[PDB]
Write an enzyme that holds these catalytic residues in place. Structure first.
Site, PDB file in Angstrom:
ATOM      1  N   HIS A  31      44.961  48.392  42.135  1.00  0.00           N
ATOM      2  CA  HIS A  31      44.974  48.564  40.681  1.00  0.00           C
ATOM      3  C   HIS A  31      43.600  48.319  40.054  1.00  0.00           C
ATOM      4  CE1 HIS A  31      45.848  44.132  40.804  1.00  0.00           C
ATOM      5  NE2 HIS A  31      45.228  44.124  39.638  1.00  0.00           N
ATOM      6  N   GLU A  53      48.655  48.278  47.406  1.00  0.00           N
ATOM      7  CA  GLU A  53      47.702  47.515  46.607  1.00  0.00           C
ATOM      8  C   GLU A  53      46.455  47.143  47.404  1.00  0.00           C
ATOM      9  OE1 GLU A  53      48.517  48.429  43.383  1.00  0.00           O
ATOM     10  OE2 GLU A  53      46.996  46.824  43.398  1.00  0.00           O
ATOM     11  N   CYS A 128      41.161  39.784  40.639  1.00  0.00           N
ATOM     12  CA  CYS A 128      41.757  40.505  41.752  1.00  0.00           C
ATOM     13  C   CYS A 128      40.696  41.228  42.561  1.00  0.00           C
ATOM     14  CB  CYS A 128      42.809  41.504  41.280  1.00  0.00           C
ATOM     15  SG  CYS A 128      44.349  40.696  40.855  1.00  0.00           S
TER      16      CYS A 128
END
Length: 158
Positions: A31, A53, A128
């Protein structure tokens, strides 16, 4: 304790970070990846693998020749890892996390094949892609993906 060179593998990228496994291999969280013609200048024409992911770029020119090539494992339960978090301010914040089970999950409508872990200093939006690492006699074992509302984090793995 982590050498500066290992921290220098952590790279701002998209809405988060990525990590140079080697001079040619870059990993990050899906993402965070820009929905572009090129990466680091190289045109995708790069071998790009996205699964759950987890995203990995294999470039065909050496991007960080200053670096040696570390092992990328598909996870590491009980392994105490270090998440190499960089913040926008330059602050370096290696979190200690005890890893647990591997379980796939749909977090906010995103298939995440990941591994869970508890924070032995928390994470935030923007973290992230940060690498989960440990040292055998250095290995990378995932990229940061999510954290519970409160101490438990999740890395996407391969």
């Amino acid at each position: 304790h982590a050498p500066p060179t290992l921290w220098s593998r952590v790279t701002k990228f998209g809405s988060g970070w990525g990590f140079w496994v080697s001079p040619t291999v870059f990993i990050t969280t899906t993402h965070v990846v820009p929905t572009v013609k090129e990466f680091f200048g190289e045109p995708l024409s790069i071998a790009i693998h996205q699964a759950g992911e987890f995203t990995q770029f294999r470039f065909s020119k050496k991007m960080r020749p200053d670096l040696t090539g570390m092992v990328l494992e598909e996870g590491c339960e009980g392994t105490v890892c270090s998440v190499l978090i960089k913040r926008d301010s330059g602050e370096l914040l290696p979190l200690a996390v005890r890893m647990g089970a591997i379980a796939s999950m749909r977090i906010q409508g995103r298939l995440v094949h990941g591994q869970s872990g508890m924070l032995l200093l928390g994470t935030i939006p923007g973290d992230c892609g940060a690498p989960y690492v440990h040292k055998r006699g250095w290995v990378v074992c995932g990229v940061h993906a999510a954290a519970t509302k409160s101490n438990t984090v999740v890395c996407a793995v391969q």
